Point group: C2
Protein backbone atom coordinates (compact mmCIF):
# COMPACT_ATOMS: atom_id res chain seq x y z
CA UNK A 1 0.00 0.00 0.00
CA UNK A 2 1.04 3.57 -0.68
CA UNK A 3 0.16 6.32 1.77
CA UNK A 4 -2.68 7.26 -0.64
CA UNK A 5 -4.22 3.87 0.06
CA UNK A 6 -4.77 4.77 3.72
CA UNK A 7 -7.76 6.82 4.92
CA UNK A 8 -5.93 10.12 5.42
CA UNK A 9 -7.21 13.69 5.10
CA UNK A 10 -6.67 15.14 1.58
CA UNK A 11 -4.40 17.85 3.02
CA UNK A 12 -2.18 15.26 4.66
CA UNK A 13 -1.89 13.24 1.46
CA UNK A 14 -1.04 16.49 -0.34
CA UNK A 15 1.70 17.31 2.15
CA UNK A 16 3.14 13.80 1.94
CA UNK A 17 3.04 13.88 -1.86
CA UNK A 18 4.81 17.22 -2.09
CA UNK A 19 7.62 15.83 0.05
CA UNK A 20 8.30 12.73 -2.03
CA UNK A 21 6.83 10.54 0.70
CA UNK A 22 4.79 7.80 -0.97
CA UNK A 23 5.71 4.44 0.51
CA UNK A 24 5.46 3.37 4.13
CA UNK A 25 8.34 1.28 5.40
CA UNK A 26 7.29 -2.21 6.56
CA UNK A 27 6.95 -1.07 10.20
CA UNK A 28 4.79 1.88 9.13
CA UNK A 29 2.68 -0.28 6.80
CA UNK A 30 1.75 -2.68 9.62
CA UNK A 31 1.42 0.04 12.26
CA UNK A 32 -0.88 2.48 10.45
CA UNK A 33 -4.19 0.58 10.51
CA UNK A 34 -3.98 0.14 14.29
CA UNK A 35 -2.42 3.50 15.07
CA UNK A 36 -4.97 5.40 12.97
CA UNK A 37 -7.69 3.78 15.07
CA UNK A 38 -6.10 4.97 18.30
CA UNK A 39 -4.57 1.68 19.45
CA UNK A 40 -1.36 1.33 21.46
CA UNK A 41 1.62 -0.14 19.67
CA UNK A 42 5.16 -1.22 20.28
CA UNK A 43 7.35 -0.87 17.20
CA UNK A 44 10.60 -2.81 17.18
CA UNK A 45 13.06 -1.98 14.40
CA UNK A 46 16.77 -1.51 13.66
CA UNK A 47 18.00 1.91 14.77
CA UNK A 48 17.94 4.45 11.95
CA UNK A 49 15.15 2.65 10.11
CA UNK A 50 12.40 5.01 9.00
CA UNK A 51 9.37 4.81 11.28
CA UNK A 52 8.46 8.43 11.91
CA UNK A 53 5.26 8.33 9.88
CA UNK A 54 3.99 5.46 12.05
CA UNK A 55 3.26 8.09 14.70
CA UNK A 56 3.43 11.36 12.77
CA UNK A 57 0.48 10.43 10.55
CA UNK A 58 -1.73 9.19 13.39
CA UNK A 59 -1.08 12.48 15.25
CA UNK A 60 -1.81 14.52 12.10
CA UNK A 61 -5.01 12.61 11.31
CA UNK A 62 -6.30 12.52 14.90
CA UNK A 63 -5.73 16.17 15.81
CA UNK A 64 -7.92 18.92 14.39
CA UNK A 65 -6.59 22.49 14.26
CA UNK A 66 -7.04 24.95 17.15
CA UNK A 67 -6.40 28.65 17.65
CA UNK A 68 -6.99 28.83 21.41
CA UNK A 69 -3.99 30.86 22.59
CA UNK A 70 -2.15 29.31 25.53
CA UNK A 71 -3.67 25.94 24.64
CA UNK A 72 -1.92 22.84 25.97
CA UNK A 73 -0.42 20.18 23.66
CA UNK A 74 -2.49 17.16 22.61
CA UNK A 75 0.53 15.15 21.56
CA UNK A 76 3.84 14.52 23.29
CA UNK A 77 6.83 12.82 21.71
CA UNK A 78 9.75 11.99 24.00
CA UNK A 79 13.10 11.52 22.28
CA UNK A 80 16.67 11.20 23.63
CA UNK A 81 18.53 14.09 21.98
CA UNK A 82 18.21 17.69 20.78
CA UNK A 83 19.12 16.48 17.32
CA UNK A 84 16.28 14.00 17.22
CA UNK A 85 13.83 16.47 18.73
CA UNK A 86 14.62 18.96 15.97
CA UNK A 87 14.48 16.23 13.30
CA UNK A 88 11.20 14.71 14.51
CA UNK A 89 9.58 18.11 15.14
CA UNK A 90 10.53 19.03 11.57
CA UNK A 91 8.99 15.97 9.93
CA UNK A 92 5.84 16.23 12.04
CA UNK A 93 5.44 19.90 11.11
CA UNK A 94 5.62 18.87 7.45
CA UNK A 95 3.04 16.05 7.62
CA UNK A 96 0.75 18.04 9.93
CA UNK A 97 0.62 21.50 8.33
CA UNK A 98 -2.45 22.29 10.45
CA UNK A 99 -0.65 21.76 13.76
CA UNK A 100 1.68 23.87 15.87
CA UNK A 101 4.73 21.76 16.79
CA UNK A 102 7.22 22.91 19.42
CA UNK A 103 10.59 21.28 20.03
CA UNK A 104 11.89 21.28 23.60
CA UNK A 105 15.37 20.40 24.83
CA UNK A 106 18.26 21.25 27.14
CA UNK A 107 21.57 22.90 26.32
CA UNK A 108 20.00 26.35 26.04
CA UNK A 109 18.02 28.92 28.04
CA UNK A 110 14.37 28.57 29.07
CA UNK A 111 12.83 31.74 27.60
CA UNK A 112 12.24 30.90 23.93
CA UNK A 113 10.87 27.39 24.41
CA UNK A 114 8.93 28.69 27.40
CA UNK A 115 7.31 31.45 25.35
CA UNK A 116 6.32 29.02 22.60
CA UNK A 117 4.53 26.85 25.14
CA UNK A 118 2.88 29.94 26.60
CA UNK A 119 1.68 31.04 23.15
CA UNK A 120 0.25 27.59 22.58
CA UNK A 121 1.16 24.16 21.26
CA UNK A 122 -0.58 21.29 19.57
CA UNK A 123 2.37 18.88 19.76
CA UNK A 124 5.56 18.98 21.82
CA UNK A 125 8.64 16.98 20.79
CA UNK A 126 10.96 16.94 23.80
CA UNK A 127 13.97 15.47 25.56
CA UNK A 128 12.87 14.11 28.94
CA UNK A 129 15.11 16.19 31.24
CA UNK A 130 13.99 19.52 29.84
CA UNK A 131 10.33 18.43 29.58
CA UNK A 132 10.25 17.42 33.26
CA UNK A 133 11.88 20.77 34.12
CA UNK A 134 8.96 22.61 32.47
CA UNK A 135 6.37 20.31 34.07
CA UNK A 136 7.36 20.95 37.71
CA UNK A 137 7.60 24.63 36.84
CA UNK A 138 3.99 24.65 35.67
CA UNK A 139 4.93 25.79 32.17
CA UNK A 140 4.39 22.49 30.34
CA UNK A 141 0.88 21.16 30.89
CA UNK A 142 0.29 17.53 29.94
CA UNK A 143 -3.32 17.15 31.11
CA UNK A 144 -4.72 17.21 27.56
CA UNK A 145 -2.26 14.86 25.85
CA UNK A 146 -4.19 12.40 23.63
CA UNK A 147 -1.15 10.71 22.09
CA UNK A 148 2.22 10.01 23.71
CA UNK A 149 5.17 8.63 21.76
CA UNK A 150 8.40 7.20 23.11
CA UNK A 151 11.05 7.49 20.38
CA UNK A 152 14.34 5.53 20.61
CA UNK A 153 13.38 4.29 24.09
CA UNK A 154 16.52 2.11 24.35
CA UNK A 155 18.68 5.20 24.03
CA UNK A 156 16.49 7.12 26.46
CA UNK A 157 17.17 4.21 28.83
CA UNK A 158 20.93 4.12 28.25
CA UNK A 159 21.08 7.89 28.80
CA UNK A 160 19.45 7.48 32.24
CA UNK A 161 16.08 9.10 31.54
CA UNK A 162 13.94 6.22 32.94
CA UNK A 163 12.51 8.15 35.87
CA UNK A 164 11.88 11.28 33.83
CA UNK A 165 10.09 9.39 31.07
CA UNK A 166 7.83 7.69 33.62
CA UNK A 167 7.05 10.92 35.49
CA UNK A 168 6.07 12.63 32.24
CA UNK A 169 3.84 9.73 31.14
CA UNK A 170 2.24 9.62 34.59
CA UNK A 171 1.38 13.29 34.15
CA UNK A 172 -0.68 12.54 31.03
CA UNK A 173 -4.22 11.14 30.99
CA UNK A 174 -4.19 7.31 31.12
CA UNK A 175 -6.91 7.39 28.44
CA UNK A 176 -4.30 8.57 25.93
CA UNK A 177 -2.96 6.49 23.07
CA UNK A 178 0.65 5.42 23.57
CA UNK A 179 3.21 4.34 20.96
CA UNK A 180 6.53 2.90 22.07
CA UNK A 181 9.58 2.40 19.86
CA UNK A 182 12.31 0.11 21.19
CA UNK A 183 14.94 -1.72 19.15
CA UNK A 184 15.62 -4.48 21.70
CA UNK A 185 12.69 -4.49 24.15
CA UNK A 186 14.78 -4.52 27.40
CA UNK A 187 13.22 -4.98 30.84
CA UNK A 188 12.34 -1.28 31.15
CA UNK A 189 10.43 -1.22 27.87
CA UNK A 190 8.45 -4.26 29.02
CA UNK A 191 7.64 -2.49 32.30
CA UNK A 192 6.46 0.55 30.31
CA UNK A 193 4.24 -1.65 28.17
CA UNK A 194 2.73 -3.17 31.30
CA UNK A 195 2.25 0.02 33.32
CA UNK A 196 1.62 2.71 30.72
CA UNK A 197 0.07 0.94 27.73
CA UNK A 198 -3.22 -0.74 26.92
CA UNK A 199 -2.96 -4.16 25.25
CA UNK A 200 -0.19 -2.89 22.94
CA UNK A 201 0.30 -4.67 19.63
CA UNK A 202 3.92 -5.55 19.00
CA UNK A 203 5.28 -5.09 15.51
CA UNK A 204 8.82 -6.40 15.04
CA UNK A 205 10.61 -5.75 11.74
CA UNK A 206 14.14 -6.63 12.80
CA UNK A 207 13.79 -9.70 10.57
CA UNK B 1 -10.08 0.72 9.15
CA UNK B 2 -12.88 -1.31 7.55
CA UNK B 3 -12.23 -3.89 4.84
CA UNK B 4 -13.43 -1.31 2.28
CA UNK B 5 -10.54 0.93 3.36
CA UNK B 6 -8.01 -1.55 1.95
CA UNK B 7 -7.21 -1.93 -1.78
CA UNK B 8 -9.39 -4.98 -2.39
CA UNK B 9 -11.24 -5.98 -5.55
CA UNK B 10 -14.87 -4.83 -5.46
CA UNK B 11 -16.10 -8.41 -5.88
CA UNK B 12 -14.03 -9.50 -2.90
CA UNK B 13 -15.49 -6.66 -0.82
CA UNK B 14 -18.92 -7.78 -2.04
CA UNK B 15 -18.24 -11.32 -0.84
CA UNK B 16 -17.22 -10.02 2.60
CA UNK B 17 -20.23 -7.75 3.01
CA UNK B 18 -22.38 -10.68 1.88
CA UNK B 19 -21.00 -12.76 4.76
CA UNK B 20 -21.69 -9.86 7.13
CA UNK B 21 -17.99 -9.08 7.65
CA UNK B 22 -16.98 -5.41 7.50
CA UNK B 23 -14.20 -4.97 10.03
CA UNK B 24 -10.83 -6.70 10.36
CA UNK B 25 -9.63 -7.88 13.75
CA UNK B 26 -6.41 -6.28 14.98
CA UNK B 27 -4.19 -9.06 13.62
CA UNK B 28 -5.94 -8.84 10.22
CA UNK B 29 -5.76 -5.05 10.08
CA UNK B 30 -2.04 -4.95 10.85
CA UNK B 31 -1.21 -7.90 8.59
CA UNK B 32 -3.16 -6.86 5.50
CA UNK B 33 -0.97 -4.06 4.11
CA UNK B 34 2.13 -6.28 4.09
CA UNK B 35 0.38 -9.53 3.14
CA UNK B 36 -1.38 -7.90 0.18
CA UNK B 37 2.00 -6.76 -1.14
CA UNK B 38 3.28 -10.32 -0.98
CA UNK B 39 5.51 -10.04 2.10
CA UNK B 40 6.16 -12.79 4.65
CA UNK B 41 4.77 -12.41 8.16
CA UNK B 42 4.37 -14.19 11.45
CA UNK B 43 1.02 -13.46 13.04
CA UNK B 44 0.89 -14.10 16.76
CA UNK B 45 -2.79 -14.24 17.74
CA UNK B 46 -4.94 -16.61 19.76
CA UNK B 47 -5.97 -19.98 18.35
CA UNK B 48 -9.44 -20.27 16.85
CA UNK B 49 -11.38 -17.63 14.96
CA UNK B 50 -10.17 -14.13 14.26
CA UNK B 51 -7.30 -14.44 11.78
CA UNK B 52 -8.53 -16.20 8.63
CA UNK B 53 -8.92 -13.05 6.57
CA UNK B 54 -5.28 -12.12 7.18
CA UNK B 55 -4.41 -14.88 4.76
CA UNK B 56 -7.68 -15.56 2.92
CA UNK B 57 -7.95 -12.06 1.50
CA UNK B 58 -4.34 -11.99 0.23
CA UNK B 59 -4.93 -15.37 -1.46
CA UNK B 60 -8.17 -14.06 -2.99
CA UNK B 61 -6.47 -10.86 -4.21
CA UNK B 62 -3.30 -12.45 -5.53
CA UNK B 63 -4.74 -15.37 -7.52
CA UNK B 64 -6.57 -14.68 -10.76
CA UNK B 65 -9.27 -17.05 -12.03
CA UNK B 66 -8.16 -20.13 -13.97
CA UNK B 67 -10.16 -22.72 -15.87
CA UNK B 68 -7.35 -25.14 -16.71
CA UNK B 69 -8.52 -28.72 -16.11
CA UNK B 70 -6.17 -30.56 -13.75
CA UNK B 71 -4.44 -27.34 -12.73
CA UNK B 72 -2.19 -27.45 -9.68
CA UNK B 73 -2.88 -25.29 -6.60
CA UNK B 74 -1.33 -21.84 -6.29
CA UNK B 75 -2.01 -21.56 -2.56
CA UNK B 76 -1.48 -24.13 0.21
CA UNK B 77 -2.93 -23.68 3.70
CA UNK B 78 -1.96 -26.21 6.34
CA UNK B 79 -4.09 -26.71 9.47
CA UNK B 80 -3.35 -29.00 12.45
CA UNK B 81 -6.77 -30.68 12.54
CA UNK B 82 -9.33 -32.17 10.20
CA UNK B 83 -12.03 -29.99 11.74
CA UNK B 84 -10.01 -26.87 10.97
CA UNK B 85 -9.20 -28.00 7.43
CA UNK B 86 -12.95 -28.12 6.74
CA UNK B 87 -13.64 -24.82 8.51
CA UNK B 88 -10.84 -22.86 6.88
CA UNK B 89 -11.67 -24.31 3.45
CA UNK B 90 -15.25 -23.03 3.91
CA UNK B 91 -14.11 -19.59 5.05
CA UNK B 92 -11.64 -19.22 2.18
CA UNK B 93 -14.24 -20.48 -0.32
CA UNK B 94 -16.60 -17.71 0.71
CA UNK B 95 -14.12 -14.85 0.29
CA UNK B 96 -12.52 -16.19 -2.92
CA UNK B 97 -15.60 -17.08 -4.98
CA UNK B 98 -13.50 -17.00 -8.16
CA UNK B 99 -11.20 -19.76 -6.91
CA UNK B 100 -11.65 -23.52 -6.54
CA UNK B 101 -10.79 -24.47 -2.95
CA UNK B 102 -10.21 -28.14 -2.09
CA UNK B 103 -10.06 -29.47 1.48
CA UNK B 104 -7.69 -32.38 2.13
CA UNK B 105 -7.71 -34.33 5.40
CA UNK B 106 -7.71 -37.81 6.97
CA UNK B 107 -10.55 -39.49 8.85
CA UNK B 108 -12.24 -40.56 5.62
CA UNK B 109 -11.33 -42.35 2.40
CA UNK B 110 -8.94 -41.15 -0.30
CA UNK B 111 -11.31 -41.30 -3.28
CA UNK B 112 -13.20 -38.01 -3.29
CA UNK B 113 -10.24 -35.79 -2.39
CA UNK B 114 -8.07 -37.48 -5.01
CA UNK B 115 -10.82 -36.93 -7.60
CA UNK B 116 -11.08 -33.24 -6.66
CA UNK B 117 -7.32 -32.66 -6.90
CA UNK B 118 -7.14 -34.38 -10.29
CA UNK B 119 -9.97 -32.21 -11.65
CA UNK B 120 -7.89 -29.22 -10.56
CA UNK B 121 -7.57 -26.80 -7.68
CA UNK B 122 -6.59 -23.20 -7.04
CA UNK B 123 -6.11 -23.49 -3.25
CA UNK B 124 -5.70 -26.54 -1.03
CA UNK B 125 -6.46 -26.47 2.68
CA UNK B 126 -4.95 -29.58 4.27
CA UNK B 127 -3.79 -31.44 7.34
CA UNK B 128 -0.12 -32.32 7.02
CA UNK B 129 -0.29 -36.13 7.02
CA UNK B 130 -2.88 -36.38 4.28
CA UNK B 131 -1.23 -33.61 2.22
CA UNK B 132 2.12 -35.41 2.37
CA UNK B 133 0.48 -38.74 1.49
CA UNK B 134 -1.01 -37.16 -1.62
CA UNK B 135 2.34 -35.53 -2.42
CA UNK B 136 4.06 -38.93 -2.27
CA UNK B 137 1.32 -40.40 -4.50
CA UNK B 138 1.90 -37.62 -7.06
CA UNK B 139 -1.73 -36.55 -6.73
CA UNK B 140 -0.89 -33.28 -4.95
CA UNK B 141 1.52 -31.12 -6.93
CA UNK B 142 3.06 -28.20 -5.05
CA UNK B 143 5.32 -26.82 -7.80
CA UNK B 144 3.03 -23.86 -8.54
CA UNK B 145 2.45 -22.75 -4.96
CA UNK B 146 2.73 -18.95 -4.68
CA UNK B 147 1.40 -18.63 -1.13
CA UNK B 148 1.92 -21.02 1.76
CA UNK B 149 0.13 -20.61 5.09
CA UNK B 150 0.63 -22.39 8.38
CA UNK B 151 -2.51 -21.82 10.44
CA UNK B 152 -1.89 -22.60 14.12
CA UNK B 153 1.65 -23.82 14.00
CA UNK B 154 1.77 -24.48 17.79
CA UNK B 155 -0.77 -27.26 17.52
CA UNK B 156 1.02 -28.75 14.52
CA UNK B 157 4.01 -28.99 16.84
CA UNK B 158 2.04 -30.46 19.75
CA UNK B 159 0.46 -33.09 17.48
CA UNK B 160 3.93 -33.99 16.22
CA UNK B 161 3.59 -32.90 12.58
CA UNK B 162 6.95 -31.05 12.39
CA UNK B 163 8.57 -33.42 9.92
CA UNK B 164 5.51 -33.43 7.61
CA UNK B 165 5.14 -29.65 7.68
CA UNK B 166 8.81 -29.18 6.83
CA UNK B 167 8.65 -31.72 3.98
CA UNK B 168 5.62 -29.95 2.53
CA UNK B 169 7.22 -26.49 2.80
CA UNK B 170 10.38 -27.89 1.18
CA UNK B 171 8.32 -29.20 -1.76
CA UNK B 172 7.08 -25.67 -2.61
CA UNK B 173 8.98 -22.97 -4.54
CA UNK B 174 11.04 -20.74 -2.19
CA UNK B 175 9.97 -17.78 -4.33
CA UNK B 176 6.57 -18.13 -2.64
CA UNK B 177 5.05 -15.91 0.01
CA UNK B 178 4.80 -17.55 3.48
CA UNK B 179 2.43 -16.57 6.28
CA UNK B 180 2.77 -18.32 9.65
CA UNK B 181 0.23 -18.03 12.46
CA UNK B 182 0.83 -19.15 15.98
CA UNK B 183 -0.19 -18.16 19.47
CA UNK B 184 3.13 -18.75 21.34
CA UNK B 185 6.14 -18.74 18.97
CA UNK B 186 8.06 -21.82 20.28
CA UNK B 187 11.60 -22.66 19.14
CA UNK B 188 10.33 -24.81 16.27
CA UNK B 189 8.34 -21.92 14.80
CA UNK B 190 11.39 -19.67 15.05
CA UNK B 191 13.52 -22.22 13.20
CA UNK B 192 10.77 -22.65 10.58
CA UNK B 193 10.78 -18.91 10.04
CA UNK B 194 14.58 -18.90 9.75
CA UNK B 195 14.61 -21.73 7.21
CA UNK B 196 11.42 -21.09 5.19
CA UNK B 197 10.60 -17.40 5.47
CA UNK B 198 12.05 -14.23 4.01
CA UNK B 199 12.65 -11.39 6.49
CA UNK B 200 9.22 -11.84 8.01
CA UNK B 201 7.57 -9.10 10.02
CA UNK B 202 6.24 -10.31 13.35
CA UNK B 203 2.87 -8.97 14.54
CA UNK B 204 1.84 -10.00 18.04
CA UNK B 205 -1.62 -9.07 19.28
CA UNK B 206 -1.70 -11.39 22.28
CA UNK B 207 -3.39 -9.50 25.12
N1 LIG C 1 7.99 6.01 4.74
C1 LIG C 1 9.13 6.82 4.65
N2 LIG C 1 9.61 7.14 3.45
C2 LIG C 1 10.70 7.92 3.35
N3 LIG C 1 11.37 8.41 4.39
C3 LIG C 1 10.91 8.11 5.61
C4 LIG C 1 9.80 7.32 5.78
N4 LIG C 1 9.55 7.17 7.18
C5 LIG C 1 10.56 7.90 7.86
O1 LIG C 1 10.62 7.97 9.10
N5 LIG C 1 11.42 8.51 6.89
C6 LIG C 1 12.64 9.36 7.10
O2 LIG C 1 13.86 8.61 7.01
C7 LIG C 1 14.59 8.78 8.22
C8 LIG C 1 15.51 7.59 8.54
O3 LIG C 1 15.17 6.46 7.73
C9 LIG C 1 13.55 9.08 9.30
O4 LIG C 1 14.15 9.69 10.44
C10 LIG C 1 12.70 10.04 8.48
O5 LIG C 1 13.31 11.33 8.37
Amino acid sequence: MEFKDFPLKPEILEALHGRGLTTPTPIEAAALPLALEGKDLIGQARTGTGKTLAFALPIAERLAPSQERGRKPRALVLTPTRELALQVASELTAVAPHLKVVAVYGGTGYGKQKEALLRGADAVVATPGRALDYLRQGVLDLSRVEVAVLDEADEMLSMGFEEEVEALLSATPPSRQTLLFSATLPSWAKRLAERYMKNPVLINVIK
